[PDB]
Design a protein around this nucleic acid. Structure first.
Ligand code: MG
Length: 132
DNA sequence: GCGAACGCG
DNA sequence: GCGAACGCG
């Protein structure tokens, strides 16, 4: 069933592409462990990808073997493949989201981890604790 | 390759 | 309606 000793991440989108925020919380308590301030233009899947990679970096900094829960099977696969397969144009308006994605891919390409990245089963378990 | 035909905000 | 992931020549 649920591994309560874990990190849960999720994205808050206003439009898609549109304003992106994300956060990571303690699955057990809902305590906010990290939060990303609004990024003016991104896609939902780019935000979910960034949330998982921020989680990987957060747990590594703290010598944690906790798994990560995401409700985004798309983003879980992007992280496994070390590539965010986004369609979003690269122009002046999207430079920030793409800089963050490119830096996240660089991190994945230059680090190893054991962190399990698990699917949060929303239908079966209810909303992920990191939900906005 | 051409375009059609989950889990949101 | 968005970003994701067939038959035909
Ligand atoms: Mg959510």
């Amino acid at each position: 069933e649920i591994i309560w000793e874990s990190l849960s991440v999720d994205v808050g989108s206003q439009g898609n592409p549109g304003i992106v925020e994300y956060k990571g919380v303690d699955t057990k308590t809902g305590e906010v462990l990290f939060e990303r301030e609004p990024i003016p233009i991104g896609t939902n899947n780019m935000g979910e990808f960034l949330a998982i990679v921020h989680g990987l970096r957060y747990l590594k900094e703290r010598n944690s073997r906790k798994p990560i829960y995401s409700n985004s099977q798309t983003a879980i696969k992007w992280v496994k493949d070390k590539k965010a397969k986004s369609t979003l144009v690269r122009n002046e308006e999207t430079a920030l989201i793409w800089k963050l994605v490119d830096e996240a891919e660089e991190w994945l390409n230059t680090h190893t981890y054991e962190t399990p990245i698990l699917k949060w089963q929303t239908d079966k378990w209810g909303e992920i604790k990191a939900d906005y």
